[PDB]
Amino acid sequence: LFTVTAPKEVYTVDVGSSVSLECDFDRRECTELEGIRASLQKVENDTSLQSERATLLEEQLPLGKALFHIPSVQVRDSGQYRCLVICGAAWDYKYLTVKVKASY
Ligand code: NA
């Protein structure tokens, strides 16, 4: 059965650093024939369906890894996200949380 899993549920990141948010999926059940789509969606306070600040690192997809990279994390990146992977009609998702640390 197609499932998504999150190796880590909470990521703690210093303001200004990078983070690679990971969700793993059963690549054996996907085909670039039927298509794969991955999406990191911010749960609260975002007018876009998918996070505009993250980029999927596509080279990991053949390993069943959806890695969503934010190169310079900002305070407003904090909060819960859903990582969604779709392979054809199959899909699953998990939640992860980004906690942003700042020192003033
Ligand atoms: Na937040």
The domain that holds 57 is classified in CATH as 2.60.40.10
Specify whether the CB–CB gap between 75 and 103 falls below 8 A. Answer: no
- State the residue for tokens 């369906």: 49
Q: What is the DSSP letter of 46?
A: -
CA of 78 to the centre of ligand 1 (A): 4
CA of 15 to the centre of ligand 1 (A): 13
What are the start-end ranges of the H helices in 1-104?
none
CA of 41 to the centre of ligand 1 (A): 13
Structural domain span for residue 57: 1-104
Q: Buried b vs exposed e over 32-61: b needs ≥16 C-beta within 10 Å? A: eeeebebbbbbeeeeeeebbebbebeeebb
Q: Buried b vs exposed e over 79-92: b needs ≥16 C-beta within 10 Å? A: eebbbbbbbeebeb
- State the residue for tokens 């306070």: 45
Specify whether the CB–CB gap between 16 and 101 falls below 8 A. Answer: no
Dihedral, CA of residue 95, residue 9, residue 63 and residue 93, to nearest 10: -10
Give the experimental resolution in Å: 1.8
Residues with CB under 5 A from ligand 1 (ion): 78-79
4 vs 23: CA distance, rounded Å: 6
Q: Coil, strand or helix: which one is 90? A: strand
Count of domains for the chain: 1
**Which pair of tokens denotes residue 25?**
């999926």
